Design a protein around this ligand. Structure first.
Ligand code: ADP
Ligand code: MG
Lengths: 168, 372, 168
């Protein structure tokens, strides 16, 4: 349920764009549970899960690059926690796809559903670390080390949230 | 061209947004949760504290603590976590670009406001800040300048009488009975049905029970009598686990603590009697206008039927020759925020902030000779 | 209760005419509490309150224009106090109308009554600053700066008040 969270543009250019790729591949992945998308058998779900695993490893790399220059605890510990979560989810997805592929070529819907739940947890972790990396980047923009990565607050496309309903 | 930030740091719901607006952008419960179990998975064990809605979603595995109890702040290391979540994580603004406006219940300790403005200056580096009384903003939100304010939040319940511009500080009546005590009394009174809610994660569930079920009776004795012939007052509420619960007279014995505080042992008067007690502390000339203008902010005045009982219970105490009008606006839960969106965006206000250059030469004691 | 105070003509040409417009729109606004005027729902009361807010902002502008050339305290402090009152009332009315409109389009008589009381306080403030601006203009007519605004005492249509009753 991150389409309401994924209100961005094609800016950011390193973090937001692969986050949008992972969001659209989740939105096409979990449509297979409704069964009206471009996914027919189970092996394309394995290739999709391998795609999100590789993209989560790349996001883990970029999150490790931004986390070196954050000075102290206040957001850096949150960022490291979400990085360990996305590392666990991607590495679990990587070699959970292999056992489902080997079950497939040696002998049928719940097999997709486990990878669907793993991808859902991976997507929640990746939007959490996108938010945490935004906080860590725009918190310490005057600090040395952040300015060399060249990620200003304008480059993030996070608008202010909606007006909360006053009644009902 | 710059805007001002307003942040009502309530006892149960932090609300925050920009000045000049008509609704808060961020509203979330002011809870700090620590995990209390082992964490056998090798990931998801480093996240040491959770704040706001991500703690409200995961409340089964967290000890939950409110840093604000009865208006005062008892844990500063959690309150700076909640403010840090408020500005960066949900409003997504920097504090150094916007001046901020915070909210304080009247007759609070001075050390609370002092450490509040010290944390707001020497940690977030705001350009300017202002703390305002929680009840004087409700009259801004109601559009009026006369009247008494019955602000019953989650922490405290305060009545402040304000004639046209001028408050009366000798009649500010602050009572420590509010929505958290009604929640604890609902925990205590639901034991007689058989349901046991013991941990701090079940306080959220019984708070939701108080949200969707509890109304206040116009007359208490006959409504108690018709609950003995139990035919139409029971109501079923579904738990997060799936078990349904049936509630009878506990549906209306919970808000009745607001009008009879002897149920929880508090030696005080109910919110109908301290209102007439506080109007009678005022002068005899402004008493007519204060009787006829009774605003009600705060979420604990959002029970179904509290305006009718408030009017009926004052009009048995007041003289019967001029009317009582308990004006209850429909958006009143956010009412303390709405006036905060007014006063911060008002054009004649901008030379009554507390600038950083005014703070560093006078220390944190500048906040007393500026706000009240 | 300013219809007895609003005994003027269409003269004055900058201050008195918008004061008469605000007086007639109050007299048509508070008739909705009696419910026999041209106001039927609550949204036209919102448009009326927005009209009085814009007119109060214009009156605040003109009151700021006359208050620059008044030399010292005797009436200028009174004029500045009533200008801050009318600024507070108009700015409170402006974004108190918005929350009532958003409550209206998201889900019923007291909703009008709060804006009615705000407009009543705004009208008392505007007739007070009309009287104070008259005093400040006709007090210092020989003073330099007042003569450039071209507002003589003849242009104001304030007559002498009624004979007070000697008996009863
Ligand atoms: N309709 C309602 N019925 C029962 N309780 C409510 C209702 N609305 C709000 N509350 C209670 O009031 C609180 C709302 O927060 P509130 O106390 O108004 O914030 P603040 O602390 O700023 O006053 C919630 O904790 C909830 O327990
Ligand atoms: Mg409160």
């Amino acid at each position: 349920l991150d389409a309401e969270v994924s209100k961005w543009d094609d800016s950011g250019n390193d973090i937001i764009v692969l986050a949008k790729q992972m969001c659209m591949i989740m939105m096409e992945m979990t449509d297979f549970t409704r069964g009206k998308g471009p996914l027919k058998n189970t092996s394309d779900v394995i290739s999709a899960a391998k795609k999100i695993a590789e993209a989560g490893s790349r996001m883990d790399k970029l999150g490790r690059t931004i986390a070196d220059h954050c000075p102290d605890s206040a957001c850096k510990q949150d960022l490291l926690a979400y990085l360990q979560r996305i590392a666990l989810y991607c590495h679990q997805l990587n070699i959970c796809s292999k056992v489902k592929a080997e079950v497939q070529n040696l002998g049928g819907v719940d097999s997709a559903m486990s990878l669907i739940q793993a991808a859902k947890n991976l997507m929640n972790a990746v939007v959490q670390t996108v938010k945490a990396s935004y906080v860590a980047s725009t918190k310490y923009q005057k600090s040395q080390g952040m300015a060399s990565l060249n990620l200003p607050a304008v480059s993030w496309k996070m608008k202010a949230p909606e007006k909360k309903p006053l009644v009902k | 061209e710059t805007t001002a930030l307003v942040c009502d740091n309530g006892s149960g719901l932090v609300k925050a947004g920009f000045a000049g607006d008509d609704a808060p952008r961020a509203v979330f419960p002011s809870i700090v949760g620590r995990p209390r179990h082992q964490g056998v998975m090798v990931g998801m064990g480093q996240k040491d504290s959770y704040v706001g809605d991500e703690a409200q979603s995961k409340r089964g595995i967290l000890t939950l603590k409110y840093p604000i109890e009865h208006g005062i702040i008892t844990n500063w290391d959690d309150m700076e976590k909640i403010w840090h979540h408020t500005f960066y994580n949900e409003l997504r603004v920097a504090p150094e670009e916007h001046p901020t406006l915070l909210t304080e219940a009247p007759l609070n300790p001075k050390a609370n406001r002092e450490k509040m403005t010290q944390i707001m200056f020497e940690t977030f580096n705001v350009p300017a800040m202002y703390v305002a009384i929680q009840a004087v903003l409700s009259l801004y939100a109601s559009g009026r300048t006369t009247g008494i304010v019955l602000d019953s939040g989650d922490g405290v319940t305060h009545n402040v009488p304000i004639y046209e511009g001028y408050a009366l500080p000798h009649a500010i009546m602050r009572l420590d009975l509010a929505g958290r005590d009604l929640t604890d009394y609902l925990m205590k009174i639901l034991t007689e049905r058989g349901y046991s809610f013991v941990t701090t994660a079940e306080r959220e569930i019984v708070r939701d029970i108080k949200e969707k079920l509890c109304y206040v009776a116009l007359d208490f004795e006959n409504e108690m009598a018709t609950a003995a012939s139990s035919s139409s007052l029971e109501k079923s509420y579904e738990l997060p686990d799936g078990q349904v619960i049936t509630i009878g007279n506990e549906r209306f014995r919970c808000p009745e603590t607001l009008f009879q505080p002897s149920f929880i042992g508090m030696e005080s008067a109910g919110i109908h009697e301290t209102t007439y007690n506080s109007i009678m502390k005022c002068d005899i000339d402004i008493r007519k206008d204060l009787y006829a203008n009774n605003v009600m902010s705060g979420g604990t005045t959002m029970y179904p039927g509290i305006a009718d009982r408030m009017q009926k219970e004052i009009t048995a105490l007041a003289p019967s020759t001029m009317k009582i009008k308990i004006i209850a606006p429909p958006e009143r839960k956010y009412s303390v925020w709405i006036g905060g969106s007014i006063l911060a965006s008002l054009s004649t206000f901008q030379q009554m902030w507390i600038t950083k250059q005014e703070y560093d030469e006078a220390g944190p004691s500048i906040v007393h000779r500026k706000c009240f």
